[PDB]
Structure 1
Amino acid sequence: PKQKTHRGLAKRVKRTGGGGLKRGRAFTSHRFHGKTKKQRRQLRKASMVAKGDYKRIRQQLARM
């Protein structure tokens, strides 16, 4: 059968032009009083999936 896509990942990541995966940042839901404004400002920015994590999950996003 067709290989299925991991819907959770599909919702949380985006494929970039270079083949990488763009992702959100954790610790951006609540309890912002426990983080400095610098932390919040720098977590607002997106990021890319690390090499090790990408090698673990790529097969689940092949046909995203």
Structure 2
Amino acid sequence: PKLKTNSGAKKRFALTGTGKIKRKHAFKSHILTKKTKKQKRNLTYFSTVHKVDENAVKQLLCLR
């Protein structure tokens, strides 16, 4: 049958123009005052999935 997309991956990742995968950063949810502003600003940015994990993320999204 048809391949099924993982429901959690399709709410956490996105594709870019050249094929890289967009992602958010962790450690940004609730324990915030003790962290530095530089740390929090770096964590607020979007990032890309690492090369060693692209295969697993693509399998989760059905090679998308």
Same fold (TM over 0.5): yes
Question: Once the 2 structures are TM-superposed, how far is the Cα of residue 63 of structure 1 from its aligned partner?
Answer: 6.4
Over the aligned positions, Cα root-mean-square deviation in angstroms equals 1.4
Q: Which residue does 1:40 correspond to in 2?
A: 40
Q: Runs of 4+ in structure 1 displaced over 6 angstroms?
A: none
1:10-44: CA deviation from partner (whole Å, max 9, x where unpaired): 00011111111100010110100221111001111
Question: Once the 2 structures are TM-superposed, how far is the Cα of residue 62 of structure 1 from its aligned partner?
Answer: 2.5
Unmatched runs of 5 consecutive residues or more in structure 1 = none
Query: Is the CA contact 1:5–1:63 (under 8 Å) kept in the aligned structure 2?
Result: no
Number of aligned residues:
64
Distance in 1 between residues matched to 2:49 and 2:59, nearest whole Å: 14
Q: Which residue does 1:31 correspond to in 2?
A: 31
Distance in 1 between residues matched to 2:38 and 2:59, nearest whole Å: 35
Unmatched runs of 5 consecutive residues or more in structure 2 = none
Please report the TM-score for the alignment, with normalisation by the length of structure 1: 0.88
Distance in 2 between residues matched to 1:11 and 1:38, nearest whole Å: 27
Q: Identical aligned pairs, as a percentage?
A: 45
Query: Is the CA contact 2:4–2:62 (under 8 Å) kept in the aligned structure 1?
Result: no
Please report the TM-score for the alignment, with normalisation by the length of structure 2: 0.88
